[PDB]
XYZ file of N, CA and C in Angstrom:
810
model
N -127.896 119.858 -50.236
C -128.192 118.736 -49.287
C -127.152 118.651 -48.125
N -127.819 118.010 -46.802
C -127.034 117.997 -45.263
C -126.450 116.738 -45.104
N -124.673 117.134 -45.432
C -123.918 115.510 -45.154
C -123.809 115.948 -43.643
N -124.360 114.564 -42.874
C -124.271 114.338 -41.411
C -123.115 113.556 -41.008
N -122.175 113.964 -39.851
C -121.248 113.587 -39.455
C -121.050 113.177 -37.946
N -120.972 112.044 -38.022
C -120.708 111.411 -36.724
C -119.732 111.365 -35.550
N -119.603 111.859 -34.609
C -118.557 112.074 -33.718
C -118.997 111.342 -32.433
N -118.024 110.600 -31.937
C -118.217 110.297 -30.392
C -117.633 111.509 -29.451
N -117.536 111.090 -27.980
C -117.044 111.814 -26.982
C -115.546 111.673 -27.039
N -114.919 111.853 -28.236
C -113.632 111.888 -27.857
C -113.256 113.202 -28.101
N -112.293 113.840 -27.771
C -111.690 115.263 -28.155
C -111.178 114.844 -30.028
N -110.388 113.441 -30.093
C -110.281 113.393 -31.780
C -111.230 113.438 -32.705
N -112.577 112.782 -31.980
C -113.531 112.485 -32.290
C -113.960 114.195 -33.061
N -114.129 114.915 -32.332
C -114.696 116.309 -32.528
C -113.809 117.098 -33.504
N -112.453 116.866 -33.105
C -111.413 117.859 -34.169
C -111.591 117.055 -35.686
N -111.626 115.390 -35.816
C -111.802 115.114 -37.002
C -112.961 115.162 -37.931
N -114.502 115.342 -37.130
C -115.579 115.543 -37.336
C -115.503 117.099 -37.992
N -115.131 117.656 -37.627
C -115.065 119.543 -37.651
C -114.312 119.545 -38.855
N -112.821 118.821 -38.843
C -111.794 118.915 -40.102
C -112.759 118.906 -41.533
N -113.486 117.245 -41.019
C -114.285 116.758 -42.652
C -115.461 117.692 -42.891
N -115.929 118.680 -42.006
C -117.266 119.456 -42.135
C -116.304 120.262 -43.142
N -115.452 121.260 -42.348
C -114.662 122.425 -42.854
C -114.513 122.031 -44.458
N -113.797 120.971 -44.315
C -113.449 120.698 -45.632
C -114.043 120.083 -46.902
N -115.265 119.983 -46.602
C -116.221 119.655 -47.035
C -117.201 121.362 -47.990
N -117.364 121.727 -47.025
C -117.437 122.952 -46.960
C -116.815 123.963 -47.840
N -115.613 123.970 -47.938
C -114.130 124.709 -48.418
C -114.440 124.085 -50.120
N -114.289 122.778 -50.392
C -114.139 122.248 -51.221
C -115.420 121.936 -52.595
N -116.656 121.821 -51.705
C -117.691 121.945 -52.527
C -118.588 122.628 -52.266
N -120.159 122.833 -52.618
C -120.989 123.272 -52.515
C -122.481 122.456 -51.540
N -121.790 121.697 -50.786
C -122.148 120.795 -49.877
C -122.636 121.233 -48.167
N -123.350 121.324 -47.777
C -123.882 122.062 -46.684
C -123.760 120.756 -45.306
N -123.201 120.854 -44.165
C -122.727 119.839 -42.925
C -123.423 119.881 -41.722
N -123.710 119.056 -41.567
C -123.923 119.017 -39.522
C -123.423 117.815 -39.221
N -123.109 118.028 -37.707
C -122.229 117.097 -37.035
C -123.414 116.665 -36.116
N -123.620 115.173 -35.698
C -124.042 114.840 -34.615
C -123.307 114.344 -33.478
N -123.217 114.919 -32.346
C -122.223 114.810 -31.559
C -122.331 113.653 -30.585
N -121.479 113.483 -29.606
C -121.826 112.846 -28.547
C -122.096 111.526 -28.716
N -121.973 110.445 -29.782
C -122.755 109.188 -29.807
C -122.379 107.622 -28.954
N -121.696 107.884 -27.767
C -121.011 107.395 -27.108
C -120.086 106.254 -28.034
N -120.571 104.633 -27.797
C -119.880 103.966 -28.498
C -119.878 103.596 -30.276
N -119.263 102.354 -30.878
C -119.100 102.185 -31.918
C -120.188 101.631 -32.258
N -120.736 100.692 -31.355
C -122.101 100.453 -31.270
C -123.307 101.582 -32.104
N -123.163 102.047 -31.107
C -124.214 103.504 -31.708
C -123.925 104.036 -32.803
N -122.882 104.434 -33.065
C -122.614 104.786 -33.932
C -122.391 103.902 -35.680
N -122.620 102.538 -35.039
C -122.720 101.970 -36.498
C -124.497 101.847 -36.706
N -125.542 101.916 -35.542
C -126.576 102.019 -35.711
C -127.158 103.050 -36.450
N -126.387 104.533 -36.187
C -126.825 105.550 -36.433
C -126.366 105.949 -37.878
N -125.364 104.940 -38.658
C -125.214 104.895 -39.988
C -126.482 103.762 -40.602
N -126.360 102.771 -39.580
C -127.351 101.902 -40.335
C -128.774 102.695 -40.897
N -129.497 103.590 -39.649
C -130.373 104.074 -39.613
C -130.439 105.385 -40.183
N -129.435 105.840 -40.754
C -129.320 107.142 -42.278
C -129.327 108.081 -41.016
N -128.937 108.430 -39.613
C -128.900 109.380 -38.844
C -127.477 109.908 -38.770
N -126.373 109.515 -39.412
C -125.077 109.954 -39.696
C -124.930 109.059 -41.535
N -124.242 110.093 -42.084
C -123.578 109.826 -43.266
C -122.118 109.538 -43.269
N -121.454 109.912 -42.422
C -120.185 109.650 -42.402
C -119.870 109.331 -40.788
N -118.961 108.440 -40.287
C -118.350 108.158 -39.231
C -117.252 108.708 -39.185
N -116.878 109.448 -38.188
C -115.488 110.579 -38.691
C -114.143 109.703 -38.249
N -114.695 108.841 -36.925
C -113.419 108.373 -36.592
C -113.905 106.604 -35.782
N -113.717 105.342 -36.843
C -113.500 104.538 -36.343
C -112.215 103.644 -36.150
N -112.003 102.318 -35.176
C -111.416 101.687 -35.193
C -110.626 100.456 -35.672
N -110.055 100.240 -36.160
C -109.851 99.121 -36.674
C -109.920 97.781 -36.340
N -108.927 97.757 -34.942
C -108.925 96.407 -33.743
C -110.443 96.648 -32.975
N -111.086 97.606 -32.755
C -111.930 97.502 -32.404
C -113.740 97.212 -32.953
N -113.991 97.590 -34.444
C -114.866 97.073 -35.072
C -114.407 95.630 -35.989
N -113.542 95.535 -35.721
C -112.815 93.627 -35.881
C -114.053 92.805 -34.993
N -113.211 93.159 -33.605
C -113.623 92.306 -32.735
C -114.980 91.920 -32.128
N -115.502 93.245 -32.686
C -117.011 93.575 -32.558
C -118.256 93.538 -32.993
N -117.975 94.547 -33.664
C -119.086 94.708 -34.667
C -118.953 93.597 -36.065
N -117.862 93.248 -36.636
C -117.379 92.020 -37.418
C -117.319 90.961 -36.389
N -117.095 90.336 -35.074
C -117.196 89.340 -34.292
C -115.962 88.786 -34.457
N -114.807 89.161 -35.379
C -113.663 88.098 -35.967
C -112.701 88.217 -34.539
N -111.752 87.554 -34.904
C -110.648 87.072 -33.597
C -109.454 88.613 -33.646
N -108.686 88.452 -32.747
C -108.082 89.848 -32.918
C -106.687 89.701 -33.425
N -106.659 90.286 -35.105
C -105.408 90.347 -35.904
C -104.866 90.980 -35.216
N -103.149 90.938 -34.925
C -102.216 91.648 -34.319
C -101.254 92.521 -35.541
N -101.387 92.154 -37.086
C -100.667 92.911 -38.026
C -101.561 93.700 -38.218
N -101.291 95.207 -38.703
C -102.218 96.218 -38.895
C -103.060 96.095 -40.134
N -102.252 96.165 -41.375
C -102.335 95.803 -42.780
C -103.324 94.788 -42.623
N -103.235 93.932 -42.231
C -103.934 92.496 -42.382
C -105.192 93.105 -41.318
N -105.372 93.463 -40.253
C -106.535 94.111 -39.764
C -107.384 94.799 -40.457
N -106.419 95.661 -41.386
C -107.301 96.383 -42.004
C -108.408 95.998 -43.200
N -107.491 94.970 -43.894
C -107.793 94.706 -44.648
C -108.956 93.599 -44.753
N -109.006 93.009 -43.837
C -109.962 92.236 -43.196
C -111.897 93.428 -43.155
N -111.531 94.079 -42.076
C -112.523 95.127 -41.994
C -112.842 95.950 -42.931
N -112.052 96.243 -44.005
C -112.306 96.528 -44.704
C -113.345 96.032 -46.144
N -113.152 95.142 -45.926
C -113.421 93.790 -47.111
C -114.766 92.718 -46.539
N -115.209 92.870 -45.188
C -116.616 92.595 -44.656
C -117.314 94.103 -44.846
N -117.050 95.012 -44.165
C -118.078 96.368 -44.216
C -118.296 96.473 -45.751
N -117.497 96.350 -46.688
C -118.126 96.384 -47.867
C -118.923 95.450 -48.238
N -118.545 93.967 -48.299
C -119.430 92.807 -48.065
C -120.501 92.747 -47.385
N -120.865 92.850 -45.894
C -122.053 92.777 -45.264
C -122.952 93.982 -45.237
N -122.244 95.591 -45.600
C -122.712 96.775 -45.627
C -122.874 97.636 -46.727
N -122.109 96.895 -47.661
C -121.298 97.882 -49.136
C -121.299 99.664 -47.870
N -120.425 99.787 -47.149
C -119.895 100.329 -46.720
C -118.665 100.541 -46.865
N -117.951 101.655 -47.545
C -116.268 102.327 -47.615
C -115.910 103.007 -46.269
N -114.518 101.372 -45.691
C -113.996 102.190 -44.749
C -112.520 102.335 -45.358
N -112.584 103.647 -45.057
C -111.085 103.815 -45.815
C -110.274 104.113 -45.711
N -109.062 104.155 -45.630
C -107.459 103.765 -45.458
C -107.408 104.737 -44.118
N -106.121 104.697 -43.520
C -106.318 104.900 -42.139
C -106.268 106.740 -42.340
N -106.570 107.844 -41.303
C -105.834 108.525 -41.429
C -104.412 108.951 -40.973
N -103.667 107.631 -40.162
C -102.147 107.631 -40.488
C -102.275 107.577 -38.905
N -102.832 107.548 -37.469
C -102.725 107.356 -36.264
C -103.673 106.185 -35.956
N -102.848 105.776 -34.716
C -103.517 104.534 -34.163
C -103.857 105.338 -32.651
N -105.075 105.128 -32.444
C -105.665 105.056 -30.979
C -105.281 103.459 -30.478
N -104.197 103.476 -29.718
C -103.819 101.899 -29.239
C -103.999 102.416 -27.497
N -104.025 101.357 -26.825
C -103.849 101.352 -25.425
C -102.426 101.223 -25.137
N -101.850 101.745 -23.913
C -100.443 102.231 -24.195
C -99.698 102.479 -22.562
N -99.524 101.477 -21.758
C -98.410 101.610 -21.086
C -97.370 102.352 -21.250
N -97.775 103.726 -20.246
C -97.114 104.859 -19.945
C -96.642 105.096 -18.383
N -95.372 105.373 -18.487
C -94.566 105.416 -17.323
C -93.868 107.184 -17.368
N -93.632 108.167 -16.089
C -92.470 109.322 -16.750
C -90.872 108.856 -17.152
N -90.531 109.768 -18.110
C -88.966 108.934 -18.201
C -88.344 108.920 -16.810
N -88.433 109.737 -15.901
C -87.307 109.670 -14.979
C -87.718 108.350 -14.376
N -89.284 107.889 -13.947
C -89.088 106.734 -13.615
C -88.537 105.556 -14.045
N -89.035 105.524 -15.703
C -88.486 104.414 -16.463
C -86.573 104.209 -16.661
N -86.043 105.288 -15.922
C -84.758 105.393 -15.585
C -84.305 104.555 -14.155
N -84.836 105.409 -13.397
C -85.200 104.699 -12.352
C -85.577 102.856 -11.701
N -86.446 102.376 -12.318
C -86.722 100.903 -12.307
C -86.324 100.267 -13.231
N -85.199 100.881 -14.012
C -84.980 100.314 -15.451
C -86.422 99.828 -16.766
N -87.239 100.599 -17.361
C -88.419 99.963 -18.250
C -88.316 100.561 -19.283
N -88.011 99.747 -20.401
C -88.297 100.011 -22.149
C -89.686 99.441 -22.354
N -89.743 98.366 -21.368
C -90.941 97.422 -22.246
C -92.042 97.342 -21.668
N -93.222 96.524 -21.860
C -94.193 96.086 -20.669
C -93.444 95.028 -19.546
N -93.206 93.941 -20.471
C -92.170 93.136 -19.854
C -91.611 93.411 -18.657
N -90.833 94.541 -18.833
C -89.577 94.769 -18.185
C -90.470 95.458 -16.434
N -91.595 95.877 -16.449
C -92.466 96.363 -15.762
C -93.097 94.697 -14.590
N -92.485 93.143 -15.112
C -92.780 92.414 -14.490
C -91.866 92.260 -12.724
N -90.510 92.274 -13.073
C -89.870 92.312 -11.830
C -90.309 92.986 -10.622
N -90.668 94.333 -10.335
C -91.347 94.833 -9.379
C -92.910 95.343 -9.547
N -93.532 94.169 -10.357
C -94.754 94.797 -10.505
C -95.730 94.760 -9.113
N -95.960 93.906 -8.363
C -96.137 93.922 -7.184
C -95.717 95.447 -6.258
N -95.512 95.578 -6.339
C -94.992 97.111 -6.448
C -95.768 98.198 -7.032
N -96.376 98.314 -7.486
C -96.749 99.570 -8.658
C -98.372 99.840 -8.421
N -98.654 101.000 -8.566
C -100.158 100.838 -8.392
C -100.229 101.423 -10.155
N -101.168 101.009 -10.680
C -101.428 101.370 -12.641
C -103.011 101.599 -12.664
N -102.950 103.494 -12.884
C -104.437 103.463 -13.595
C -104.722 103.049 -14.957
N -105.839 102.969 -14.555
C -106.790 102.345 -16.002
C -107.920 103.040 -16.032
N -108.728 102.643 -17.268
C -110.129 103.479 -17.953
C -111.196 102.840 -16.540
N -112.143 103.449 -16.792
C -113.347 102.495 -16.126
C -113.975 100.989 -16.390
N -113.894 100.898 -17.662
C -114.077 99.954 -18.481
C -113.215 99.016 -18.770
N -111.532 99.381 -18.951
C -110.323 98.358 -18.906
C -110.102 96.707 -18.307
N -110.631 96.652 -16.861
C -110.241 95.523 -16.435
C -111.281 94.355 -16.870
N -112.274 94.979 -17.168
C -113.860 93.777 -17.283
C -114.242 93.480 -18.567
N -113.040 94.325 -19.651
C -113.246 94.600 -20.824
C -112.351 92.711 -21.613
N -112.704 92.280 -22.491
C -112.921 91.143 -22.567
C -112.064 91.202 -23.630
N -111.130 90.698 -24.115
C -109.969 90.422 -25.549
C -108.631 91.271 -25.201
N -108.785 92.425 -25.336
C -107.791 92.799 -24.969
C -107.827 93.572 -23.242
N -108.127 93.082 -22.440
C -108.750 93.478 -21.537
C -107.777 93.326 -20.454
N -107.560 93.341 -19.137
C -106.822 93.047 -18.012
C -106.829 91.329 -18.218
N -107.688 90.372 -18.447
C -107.771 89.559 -18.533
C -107.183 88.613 -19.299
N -107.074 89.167 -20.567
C -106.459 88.480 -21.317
C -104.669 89.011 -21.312
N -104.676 90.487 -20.720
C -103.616 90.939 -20.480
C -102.567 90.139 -19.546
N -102.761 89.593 -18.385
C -103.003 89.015 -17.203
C -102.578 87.711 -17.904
N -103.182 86.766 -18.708
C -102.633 85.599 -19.294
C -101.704 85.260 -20.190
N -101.937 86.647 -20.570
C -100.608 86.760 -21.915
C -98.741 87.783 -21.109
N -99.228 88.469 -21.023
C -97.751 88.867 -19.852
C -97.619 87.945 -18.697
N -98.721 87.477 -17.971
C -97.817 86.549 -16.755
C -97.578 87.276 -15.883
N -98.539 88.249 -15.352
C -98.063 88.998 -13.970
C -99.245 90.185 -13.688
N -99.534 90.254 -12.398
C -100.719 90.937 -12.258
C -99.299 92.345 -11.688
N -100.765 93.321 -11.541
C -100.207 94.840 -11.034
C -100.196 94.749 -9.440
N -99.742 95.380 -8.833
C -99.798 95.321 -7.586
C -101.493 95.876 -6.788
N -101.750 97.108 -7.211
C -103.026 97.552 -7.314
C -103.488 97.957 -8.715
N -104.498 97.995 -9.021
C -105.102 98.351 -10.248
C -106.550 99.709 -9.494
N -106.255 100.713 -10.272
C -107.045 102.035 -10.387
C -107.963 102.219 -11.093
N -109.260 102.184 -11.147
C -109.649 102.845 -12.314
C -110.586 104.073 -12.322
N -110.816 104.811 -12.795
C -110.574 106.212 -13.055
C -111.192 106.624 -14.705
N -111.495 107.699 -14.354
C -112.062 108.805 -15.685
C -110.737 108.530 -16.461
N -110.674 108.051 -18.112
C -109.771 108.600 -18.479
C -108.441 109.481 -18.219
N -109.377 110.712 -18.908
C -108.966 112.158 -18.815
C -107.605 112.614 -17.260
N -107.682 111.420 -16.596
C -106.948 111.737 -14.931
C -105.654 111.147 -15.251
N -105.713 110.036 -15.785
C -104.821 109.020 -15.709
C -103.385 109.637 -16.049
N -103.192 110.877 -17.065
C -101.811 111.199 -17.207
C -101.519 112.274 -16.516
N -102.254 113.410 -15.609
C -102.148 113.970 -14.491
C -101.519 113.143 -13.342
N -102.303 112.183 -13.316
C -101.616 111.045 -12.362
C -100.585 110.262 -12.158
N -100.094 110.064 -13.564
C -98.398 109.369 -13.792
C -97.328 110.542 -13.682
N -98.144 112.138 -14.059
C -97.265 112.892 -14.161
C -96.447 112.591 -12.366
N -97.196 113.401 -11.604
C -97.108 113.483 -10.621
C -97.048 112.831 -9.539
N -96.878 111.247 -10.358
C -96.528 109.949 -9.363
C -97.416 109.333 -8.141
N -98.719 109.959 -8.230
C -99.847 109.401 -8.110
C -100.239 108.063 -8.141
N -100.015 107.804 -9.674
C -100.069 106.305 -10.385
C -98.417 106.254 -10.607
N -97.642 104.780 -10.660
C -96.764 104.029 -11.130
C -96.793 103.925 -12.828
N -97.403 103.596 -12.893
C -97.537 103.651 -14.603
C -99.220 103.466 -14.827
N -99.675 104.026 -15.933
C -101.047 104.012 -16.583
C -101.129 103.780 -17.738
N -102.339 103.209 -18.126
C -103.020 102.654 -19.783
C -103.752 104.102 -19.977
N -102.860 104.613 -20.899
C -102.943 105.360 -21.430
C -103.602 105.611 -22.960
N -104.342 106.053 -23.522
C -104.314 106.524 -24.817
C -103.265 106.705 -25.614
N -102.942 106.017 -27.090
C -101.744 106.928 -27.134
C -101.849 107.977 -28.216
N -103.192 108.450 -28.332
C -103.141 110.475 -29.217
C -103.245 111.185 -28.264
N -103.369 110.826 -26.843
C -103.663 112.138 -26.283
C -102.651 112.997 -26.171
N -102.886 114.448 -26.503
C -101.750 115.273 -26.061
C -100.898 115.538 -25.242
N -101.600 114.923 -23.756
C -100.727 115.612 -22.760
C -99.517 114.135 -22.562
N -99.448 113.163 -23.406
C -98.012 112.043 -23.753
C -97.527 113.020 -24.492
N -98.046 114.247 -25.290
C -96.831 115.134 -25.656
C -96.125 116.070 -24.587
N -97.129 116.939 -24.026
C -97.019 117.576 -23.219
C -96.232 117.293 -22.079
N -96.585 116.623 -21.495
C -95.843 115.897 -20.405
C -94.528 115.069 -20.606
N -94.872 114.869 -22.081
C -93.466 113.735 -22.368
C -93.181 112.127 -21.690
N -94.665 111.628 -21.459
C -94.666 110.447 -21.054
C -93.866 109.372 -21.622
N -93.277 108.220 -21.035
C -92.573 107.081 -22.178
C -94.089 106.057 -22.506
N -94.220 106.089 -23.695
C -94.953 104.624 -24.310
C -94.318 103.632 -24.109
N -94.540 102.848 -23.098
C -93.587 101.350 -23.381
C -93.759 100.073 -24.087
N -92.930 99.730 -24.817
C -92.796 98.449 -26.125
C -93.779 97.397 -25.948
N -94.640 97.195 -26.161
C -96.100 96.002 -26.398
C -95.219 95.012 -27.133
N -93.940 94.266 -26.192
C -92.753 93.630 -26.649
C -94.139 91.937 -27.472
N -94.810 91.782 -26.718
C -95.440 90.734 -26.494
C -96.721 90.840 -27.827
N -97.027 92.164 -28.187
C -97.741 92.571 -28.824
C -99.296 91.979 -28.379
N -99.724 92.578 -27.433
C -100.608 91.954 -26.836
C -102.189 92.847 -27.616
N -101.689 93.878 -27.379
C -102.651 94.920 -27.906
C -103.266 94.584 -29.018
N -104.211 94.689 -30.118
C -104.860 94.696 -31.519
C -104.583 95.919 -32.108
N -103.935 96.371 -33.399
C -104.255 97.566 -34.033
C -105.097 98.379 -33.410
N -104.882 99.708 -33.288
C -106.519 100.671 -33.699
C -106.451 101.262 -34.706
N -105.846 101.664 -35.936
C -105.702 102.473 -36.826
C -107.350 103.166 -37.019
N -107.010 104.532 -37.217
C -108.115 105.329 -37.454
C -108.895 105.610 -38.230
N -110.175 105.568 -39.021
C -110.247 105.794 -40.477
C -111.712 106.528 -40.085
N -112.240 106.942 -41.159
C -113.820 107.562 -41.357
C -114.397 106.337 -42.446
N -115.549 106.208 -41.923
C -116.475 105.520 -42.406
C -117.267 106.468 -43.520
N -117.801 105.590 -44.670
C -119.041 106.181 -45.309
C -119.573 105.510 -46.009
N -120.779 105.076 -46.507
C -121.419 104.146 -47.403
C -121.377 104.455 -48.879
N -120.958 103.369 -49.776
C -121.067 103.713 -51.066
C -122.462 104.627 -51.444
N -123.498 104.419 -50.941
C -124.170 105.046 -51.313
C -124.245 106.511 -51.104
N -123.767 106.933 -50.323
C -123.930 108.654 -49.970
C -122.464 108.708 -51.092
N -121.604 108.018 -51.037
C -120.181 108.527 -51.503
C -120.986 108.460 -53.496
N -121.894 107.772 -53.692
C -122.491 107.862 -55.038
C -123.644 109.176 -55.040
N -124.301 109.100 -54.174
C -125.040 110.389 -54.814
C -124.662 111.723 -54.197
N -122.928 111.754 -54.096
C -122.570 113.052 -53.994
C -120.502 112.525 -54.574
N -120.840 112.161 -55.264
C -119.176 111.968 -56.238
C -118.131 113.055 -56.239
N -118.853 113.904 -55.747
C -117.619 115.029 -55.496
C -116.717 115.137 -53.752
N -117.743 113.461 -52.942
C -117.213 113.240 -51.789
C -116.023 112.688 -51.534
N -116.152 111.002 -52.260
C -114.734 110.243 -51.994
C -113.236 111.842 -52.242
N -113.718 112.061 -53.224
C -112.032 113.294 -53.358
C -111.542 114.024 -52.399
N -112.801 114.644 -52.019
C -112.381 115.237 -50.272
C -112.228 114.481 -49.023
N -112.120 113.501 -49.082
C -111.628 112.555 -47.927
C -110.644 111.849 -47.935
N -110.286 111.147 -49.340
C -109.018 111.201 -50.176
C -108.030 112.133 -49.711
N -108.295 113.352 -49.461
C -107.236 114.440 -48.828
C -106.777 114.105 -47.649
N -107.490 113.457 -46.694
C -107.154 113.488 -45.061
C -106.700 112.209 -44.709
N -106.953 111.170 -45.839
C -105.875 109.700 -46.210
C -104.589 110.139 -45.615
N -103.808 108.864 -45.169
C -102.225 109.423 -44.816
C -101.913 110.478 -44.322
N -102.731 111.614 -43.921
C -102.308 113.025 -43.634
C -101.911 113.303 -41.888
N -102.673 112.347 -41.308
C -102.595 112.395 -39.613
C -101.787 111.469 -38.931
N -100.724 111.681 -38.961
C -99.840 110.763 -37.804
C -100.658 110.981 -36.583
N -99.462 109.794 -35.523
C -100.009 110.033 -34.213
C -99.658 111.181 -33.871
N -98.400 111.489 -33.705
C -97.749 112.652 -33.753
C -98.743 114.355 -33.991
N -98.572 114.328 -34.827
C -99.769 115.082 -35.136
C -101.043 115.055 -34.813
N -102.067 113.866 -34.340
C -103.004 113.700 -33.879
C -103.218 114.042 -32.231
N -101.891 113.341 -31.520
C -101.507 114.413 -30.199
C -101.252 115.742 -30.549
N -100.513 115.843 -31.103
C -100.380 118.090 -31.044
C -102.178 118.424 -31.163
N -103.118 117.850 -32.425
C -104.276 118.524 -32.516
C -104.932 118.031 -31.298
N -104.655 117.102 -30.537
C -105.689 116.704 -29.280
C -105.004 117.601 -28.351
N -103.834 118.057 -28.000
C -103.200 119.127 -26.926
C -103.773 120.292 -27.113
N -103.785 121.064 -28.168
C -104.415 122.209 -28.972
C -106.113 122.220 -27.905
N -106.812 121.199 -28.060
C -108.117 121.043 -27.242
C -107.991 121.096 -25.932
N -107.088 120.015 -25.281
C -107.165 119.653 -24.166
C -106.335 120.580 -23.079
N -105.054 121.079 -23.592
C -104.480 121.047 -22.986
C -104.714 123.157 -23.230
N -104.620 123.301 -24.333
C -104.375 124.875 -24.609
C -105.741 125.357 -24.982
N -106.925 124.405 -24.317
C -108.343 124.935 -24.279
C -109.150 125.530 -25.483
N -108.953 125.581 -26.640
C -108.928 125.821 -27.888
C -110.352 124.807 -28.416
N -111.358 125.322 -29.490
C -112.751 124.482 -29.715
C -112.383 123.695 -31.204
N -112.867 123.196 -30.926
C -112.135 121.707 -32.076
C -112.574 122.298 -33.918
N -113.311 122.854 -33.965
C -113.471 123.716 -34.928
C -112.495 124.700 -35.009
N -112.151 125.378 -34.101
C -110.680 126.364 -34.676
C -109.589 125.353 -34.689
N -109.001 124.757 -33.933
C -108.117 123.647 -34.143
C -108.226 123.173 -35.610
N -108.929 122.587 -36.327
C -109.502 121.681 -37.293
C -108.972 123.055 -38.327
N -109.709 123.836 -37.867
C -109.484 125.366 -39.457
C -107.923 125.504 -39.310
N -107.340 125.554 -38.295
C -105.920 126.371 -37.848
C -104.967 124.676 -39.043
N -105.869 124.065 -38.763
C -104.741 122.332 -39.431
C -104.921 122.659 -40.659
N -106.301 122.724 -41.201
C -106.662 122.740 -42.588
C -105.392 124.089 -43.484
N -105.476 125.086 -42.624
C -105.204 126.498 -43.338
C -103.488 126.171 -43.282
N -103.424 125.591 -42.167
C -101.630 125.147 -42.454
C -101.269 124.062 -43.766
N -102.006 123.593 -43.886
C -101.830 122.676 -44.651
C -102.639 122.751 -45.919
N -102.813 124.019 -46.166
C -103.466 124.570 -47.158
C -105.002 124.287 -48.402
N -105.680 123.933 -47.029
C -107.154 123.481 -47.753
C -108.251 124.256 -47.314
């Protein structure tokens, strides 16, 4: 039988989708396809509702809180989790389960030489000459509602001088090279390794968790019991750290998220 696996348009999205096929694969006698592309969390909790994915490879924590659960936005992780965790089983008997050890957070990124330069550890510290600064953002960032420019904006106490917004994917090309002043950044993407961007201190903690996890319904995880064990493996196993090197591996050193995913597995001996 075909366990179906859910991936959005993210580059993690695809390397962690590929990891759980591989290893799926490796481990039992279990046959995989991935459905790709499913834009948001939205869709993608439809497309579990509707038996068109069996597993969600990579959701959010702060973000199916606020959403898809409707609840207010926990700022402790633990307590986020545990929250979402404890409705999806309740309203879904759905297992979301423990993180795999990285947070997709939004992430005020500056280069060090600048943050030398204007003096910045923090967001905070980014208030004195913010008038000053032009800061890209996603497309979606400023109109985006909880943790949004808006609520950002009421809770720090200081607007940007200009605000950008932009494809993703540009935004750390753009801080590299001083383009942008500082950008809301991702913080797995590789090229904050690559480049060596500074993350600056969410002193205010404005942000919500994202901790990462895969979704799956008790029921597929019951009529294939040889599943929970192999996912059990990839529990705790992914820092951020590590979740940037495997997103650089894609992005940056052009590499298909399936060899990436085999090259992690075989290092780490599965």
């Amino acid at each position: 039988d075909t366990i179906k696996i859910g991936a959005q348009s993210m580059t993690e999205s695809e390397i962690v989708a590929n990891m759980i096929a591989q290893l799926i694969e490796h481990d039992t006698d279990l046959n995989t396809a991935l459905v790709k592309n499913l834009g948001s969390n939205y869709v993608q909790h439809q497309a579990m509702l509707g038996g068109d994915i069996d597993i969600s490879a990579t959701r959010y924590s702060g973000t199916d809180l606020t959403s898809t659960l409707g609840k207010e936005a926990e700022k402790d992780p633990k307590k986020a989790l545990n929250i979402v965790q404890n409705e999806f089983q309740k309203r879904f008997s759905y297992k979301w389960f423990d993180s795999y050890g990285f947070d997709n957070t939004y992430a005020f990124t500056v280069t060090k030489k600048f943050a030398e330069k204007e003096h910045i550890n923090t967001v905070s510290d980014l208030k004195k000459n913010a008038s000053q600064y032009k800061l890209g953002v996603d497309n979606a960032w400023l109109k985006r509602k909880g943790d949004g420019y808006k609520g950002f904006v009421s809770t720090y106490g200081f607007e940007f001088g200009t605000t950008y917004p932009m494809q993703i994917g540009l935004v750390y090309d753009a801080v590299k090279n001083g383009k942008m002043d500082a950008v809301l950044a991702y913080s797995t993407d590789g090229r904050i390794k690559a480049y060596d961007l500074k993350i600056l201190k969410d002193d205010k903690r404005f942000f919500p968790p994202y901790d990462c996890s895969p979704v799956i319904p008790e029921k597929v995880l019951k009529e294939h019991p040889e599943l929970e064990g192999v996912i059990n493996k990839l529990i705790g196993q992914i820092d951020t750290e590590t979740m940037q090197e495997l997103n650089y591996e894609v992005d940056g050193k052009l590499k298909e998220p399936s060899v990436v995913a085999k090259e992690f597995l075989e290092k780490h001996h599965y």
